[PDB]
Amino acid sequence: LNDDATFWRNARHHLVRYGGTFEPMIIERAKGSFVYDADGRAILDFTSGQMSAVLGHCHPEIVSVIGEYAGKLDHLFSEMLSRPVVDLATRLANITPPGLDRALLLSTGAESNEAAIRMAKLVTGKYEIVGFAQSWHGMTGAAASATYSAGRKGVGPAAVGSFAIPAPFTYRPRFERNGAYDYLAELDYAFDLIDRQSSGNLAAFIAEPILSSGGIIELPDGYMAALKRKCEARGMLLILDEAQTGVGRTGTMFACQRDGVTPDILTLSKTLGAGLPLAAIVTSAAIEERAHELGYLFYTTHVSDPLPAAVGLRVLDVVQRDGLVARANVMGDRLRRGLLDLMERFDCIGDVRGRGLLLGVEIVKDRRTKEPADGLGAKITRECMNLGLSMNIVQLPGMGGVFRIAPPLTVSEDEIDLGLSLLGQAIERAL
Amino acid sequence: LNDDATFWRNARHHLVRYGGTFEPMIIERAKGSFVYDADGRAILDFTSGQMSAVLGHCHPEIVSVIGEYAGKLDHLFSEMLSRPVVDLATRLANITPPGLDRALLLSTGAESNEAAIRMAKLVTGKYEIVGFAQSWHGMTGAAASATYSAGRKGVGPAAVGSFAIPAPFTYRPRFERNGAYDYLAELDYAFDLIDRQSSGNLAAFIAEPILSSGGIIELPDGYMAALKRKCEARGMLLILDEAQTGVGRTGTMFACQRDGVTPDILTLSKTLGAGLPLAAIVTSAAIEERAHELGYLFYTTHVSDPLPAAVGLRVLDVVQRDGLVARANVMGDRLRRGLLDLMERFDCIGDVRGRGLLLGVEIVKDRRTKEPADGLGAKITRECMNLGLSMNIVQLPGMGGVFRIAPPLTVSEDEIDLGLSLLGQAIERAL
Amino acid sequence: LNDDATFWRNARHHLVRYGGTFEPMIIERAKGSFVYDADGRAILDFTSGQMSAVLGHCHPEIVSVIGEYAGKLDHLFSEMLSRPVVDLATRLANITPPGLDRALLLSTGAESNEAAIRMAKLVTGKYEIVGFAQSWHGMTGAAASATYSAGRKGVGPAAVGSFAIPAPFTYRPRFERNGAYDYLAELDYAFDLIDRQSSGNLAAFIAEPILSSGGIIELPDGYMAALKRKCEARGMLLILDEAQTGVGRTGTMFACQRDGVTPDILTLSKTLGAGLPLAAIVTSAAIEERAHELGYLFYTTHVSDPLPAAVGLRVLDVVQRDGLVARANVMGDRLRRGLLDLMERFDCIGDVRGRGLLLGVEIVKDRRTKEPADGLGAKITRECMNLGLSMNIVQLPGMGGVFRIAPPLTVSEDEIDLGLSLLGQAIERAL
Amino acid sequence: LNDDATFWRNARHHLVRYGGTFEPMIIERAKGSFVYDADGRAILDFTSGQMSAVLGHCHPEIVSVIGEYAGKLDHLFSEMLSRPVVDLATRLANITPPGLDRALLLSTGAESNEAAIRMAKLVTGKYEIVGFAQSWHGMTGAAASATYSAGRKGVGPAAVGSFAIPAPFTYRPRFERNGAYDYLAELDYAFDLIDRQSSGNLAAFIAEPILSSGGIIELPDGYMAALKRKCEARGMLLILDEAQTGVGRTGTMFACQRDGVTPDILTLSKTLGAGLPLAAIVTSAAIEERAHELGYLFYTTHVSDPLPAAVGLRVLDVVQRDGLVARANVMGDRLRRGLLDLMERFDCIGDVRGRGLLLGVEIVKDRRTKEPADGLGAKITRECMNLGLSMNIVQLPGMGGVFRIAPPLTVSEDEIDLGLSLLGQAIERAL
């Protein structure tokens, strides 16, 4: 049983609480698209763990590689190079767009955004950073200063020079021109304001191609390109945070490939490490050279460690080889259609959006009003878990609660169907 | 050979440089106290990789546990609990001093300091952080704002409210009272200044028990206690960063046990993960409860992941069971004596300091002047590597270069001797 | 002659340049609505000096009072009270709206905004300040941090927590809803953004009722009220900066009386001192009491000095007694009509706006496009001076250049006509 | 009577309190070294009003000049030049040391420090400012951020990059080397710390030659010079704030002349305006030229106003002509000797320091301990006023309360004696 008195006792006496609420179960095993509680009940993992496991849990290949380096080459002085590191850096230079040539191999997504941000400040000689008002880049210093969906209160000033602009949100547009949502004009209008507040020290704009924690908000047609132009125009770098969207999740190896827009620095983590703590940034040779000339420093314990690098290389291999980017589009499409079928069935489903296997479903009280359905979302989530489907809902003011659905890229056609079915049931039950 | 053209070619084309210089070799394997290059030459690892591997490389136990969880329970939604996590948190509550009750399991040392710092700001309702002028707490936002040994220039303002005070340094004292180094008066004098600059928002003082990157500077007799009193007096938390000193490295499980001073929050990482990316903070039940009441948030991808937690539990087990804390004192002592013998032999060795297996050797041009020996240190380091002994030297203005010697707690009596011998040779050669 | 070689020589060798360009003449005298150069040519002062002299130059009454206190009671220890000070404070409590009860008598407009801002931060326990993107509150620290029309570049970070929102500008609207300029929705939309960037420390919003330096932009119908509600809703004070609009300039004693909106703190200066350096802030008894309980400090050399206080009391007297507030409406109206007649004559006159004797005329290349007329404005200004009419034009990006026309409240019907006539001539000449 | 019910009623209902406590009397007139209450009692003004009136109250010459410009040329558009302005700027270029060539004519001491600070940041391209831990530069933004004797709490963060170092204080030294107060080593030691906290953006050090509000602390032999060298070494400007020490108060026209050290920018106000609100900064032609090339902006309402400029020129004239700088030394010396006689009489007088007519007397409980005499100082001050001698005491932690004695440079031999006599009586009464 999940009721192990001692377990929960120790849990209550000795864990720091760091957000949300702990799920009432005891996870004892995980395999493929499932985790299993202490009774052995299999729970369908519709969020790939914490939005990371693109290959599912305990993938045999990963298991092998892990084993292999744990026993042969694990951790090293940060000045010592090895093959897994150079291979990975090389692979990444190779599968990212042209213009992205050099990599730095770290441990977390926030760390990767801090590294990119420090690099941008260094090469521009400037310090103001601009993000989206619904962004999430991490819990550490600079990543947090640029995170606007949460975490800003009660902890003192953010970093000097932090600004945000509204993200382009087609489901709930607030900037109109000639009776239509002119998200490109909204962008211009936002920048002029920024321009006016700036001390003349704009260093970068940082952005998620699809804002996940912020409500699966996908940047619309042409937006990214226009954004890149705003930056170039101001001598600012554009850093694209692809912690969740990278590595195939949205049905392209990297989301920025979809818009055909190449950022100055690209950050990776969640899906790169597929569960393990490996992250990275990739930038141009020119930017890297200038950073280096300026003494760029970002020296950590695990930067360039062989085992994690070895792991991420295996991740890319598998993804490539098993055409998991394409599986994302097919299963993605399979899942979207189901969701839309549900939506056909239940009025509370106000919107189905996202791309590939990063989909969101927005719960509303009224389609005409798009009135958020207060607690209905939480209910559905509770029912899902009872039904054996692990889900996650995010909620910001002005928005219905949004389910973030992101199964492993290794997910089966059956698993999807199972998932869709458990979900309609949870919805039927929640009403 | 280490000369693999392609290797270095790819290395040059695709790695971001992040500090220092890459060692000219290709590391292909590692085992116990050694790593091996591409020719198969065994290099004696006198810094435990990046000051982490207390159990040495590829420890069989770690190898087993790793394997075991990689295949059974790897990574989870951050709201899902499991045994390795609760066990570890519990173990830590148990082996740390009384008053430290709840843990938060993260990935890196900087991340662990950011978590502690955010917690302190939250519970005090304040934001000013004070560290040592020769500190190193990491490369991310807040950890970096509190890092004074390096990284401050070229990257814009640090965090609002960052201050430093001089660390107590008995080898190069600068605060005199009645013909003697009154480091306690220096402390008082520093705080009064701080007090005068403060906006009345002092939240914490953060400190390494022994400043490593800063030159192996050990806080002297009674200092820590007095420091803790300064904080209490100001309603500030005291955060002790034991990334390197924790887990037995200095010959006590935790360095703060040595002074018998319990900090408000304790941070762990390098030695906790013993090579893998696992970090943690531990605080009191009261502080944790208040943080929680105030909405403490620090939600990451890998917080509470089973595999890493599983790994750190095995680390503690081994350390405990093999009495590696005591091995640190014995080997530590064996090594100190050797160093002192060298010092007897070579005038350039100006000081031998540190504790347990975290020792430093300061190179000088003149013992009377304590004039730094310009390049001599770098030379010795170069000779060591030729001689097959991997070493590391740190250098700050006003100080001779310092070797940071920190072999695995699993190091043999022979390995030490080997090390001492290779070192005297390198010194003989460098002169 | 204005060509005094020595004068200009010394001028060139010994004056720091602090913005704009020095006018090529030597002012030797001033009287009523004119100043006179070294040839004795009378220049019609259409900006009341630096937008201050509501009573015109060298007003006999002011001259008397000045004389009187210079010789009897001039300057005092800031802890010594006297009649002119208590009378003035009292007068102000009396002529400002209900709810504004206590005054602090200072020297400059920036100083008065710094005092109001410090007070707001103190009583809210918070520090973030929000202003308009085209504001001007002064050159000192906090006043400057809240000034967005200029001065932000090249001088390092502004104050922590500085934000701006776009001002409501009916002549060049950029926020549309249902085919119309919905400036109230623009306001809401701006605040939500602010809300999202805030660290939860909003202390005040500071605002000019009519943005002068920013282009004579008058807050439209209902805007102020809605603004006040935004603040109340967030527990923020509303500080109204009436440096130029106060004391009758816009045809009400205070502009905020026009909207019937009472701010938490009101600041005064330019027109209060009518040329002399006297400024003030006025707040509620409750706010003042709380500030005092919290140790409010703003102790300066000239706070509470008798002579300046004596001067401002005489200013209010005269204004009251000579019904100069009403003269502002009549002459104001006389002047607006003329301007509009011009506008009837010249296509370049794109807009005539403002209120009372604070009017603006926007120069454009095209009424349909509202294309700014590049240099045309500067030309007209140059011609005016030749014609003996001192004028001033302000120019921000996205806007035609704007003449700021603000003659003394003591201005004659003839002086206005003269002014209108000189202006059409300058325009005819400039084309 | 001073008991005018109505006066105090209005006083209580309508004055904002801004520090300290209001003196219980009603000042109705002032003349020479005295002010007179409502009963007509003459109070001997031992602080020259708020440390400003070097010529005493209502000086006939000032009265004439004031009158003259009030009626002929008062206030102007900030782009219009006139004689009083160019003459004054010229005079100042002329009486300040070589290397100080161009002036900017403002209104307050804080404003003058903000102007100097903005200029320094602009020309260095940097933003960190360093002051003394017991400084007072004003209540506005940057001046306040650099003020450490008071005002820092309850009002949010100071300006980014604010630092302080301890001032050299020979009466209460805390930095010892070889049994002696090595204030030069203290300076070095302070800077190294600063260096370590800096983001590499040191723009200026700002300093009072004698810290007044901070306790009449006179920089000792050679200190200033060494300070200037610290700045030059770091590419920082040195700004000397001579608001109180300038214009003859310390027995040289400017205190920096005494050490023969020329700062990059010199600020003036209190004594320059001698009671009226006039302030100024003076810098080198080179610095000014570079500021201008960089768009230096500091455009205010009263910058370059004729009347105030006219007043300060008359002040300098009188000072020069009446050899008031020398009167300061003679009367200063007369007063110091008296003070020392008192000190001979009363043990509570722990120290008599300062220079010229800017003297301080530190009250202690014990000369051996230098134990502050708690409330004794306040008592003496209360007795002085009863005795008809207006005085002022300042008190910081770690220090006895200090009387700041600074009579008009126009003070008579008799007035001094009167003052000394009233003071010994107050002391006799207070015990």
Ligand SMILES: Cc1ncc(COP(=O)(O)O)c(/C=N/[C@H](C)P(=O)(O)O)c1O
């Ligand atoms: C005391 C301490 N705390 C925190 C960190 C941050 O660790 P991480 O960068 O992995 O987040 C370090 C890093 N150290 C260097 C990397 P070195 O080993 O050279 O002293 C540290 O020494």
Ligand SMILES: Cc1ncc(COP(=O)(O)O)c(/C=N/[C@H](C)P(=O)(O)O)c1O
């Ligand atoms: C886009 C993005 N970048 C960076 C990070 C920081 O990752 P980390 O905290 O591991 O350093 C996250 C974290 N996400 C949440 C944890 P969620 O998965 O709930 O959206 C992210 O979503």
Ligand SMILES: Cc1ncc(COP(=O)(O)O)c(/C=N/[C@H](C)P(=O)(O)O)c1O
């Ligand atoms: C050295 C110095 N610089 C600048 C200022 C700011 O002057 P202001 O506030 O008029 O702008 C002061 C004020 N002083 C007090 C008011 P005190 O006279 O009590 O020492 C000062 O002492």
Ligand SMILES: Cc1ncc(COP(=O)(O)O)c(/C=N/[C@H](C)P(=O)(O)O)c1O
């Ligand atoms: C609305 C407002 N508030 C405060 C100030 C600051 O006044 P000061 O600089 O005298 O302290 C100004 C200055 N204005 C310019 C000088 P302009 O007259 O050109 O609009 C102002 O317009």
Ligand SMILES: [K+]
């Ligand atoms: K490493």
Ligand SMILES: [K+]
């Ligand atoms: K997790």
Ligand SMILES: [K+]
């Ligand atoms: K005063």
Ligand SMILES: [K+]
């Ligand atoms: K002026």
Ligand code: NA
């Ligand atoms: Na690429």
Ligand code: NA
């Ligand atoms: Na414990």
Ligand code: NA
């Ligand atoms: Na009122």
Ligand code: NA
């Ligand atoms: Na000079």
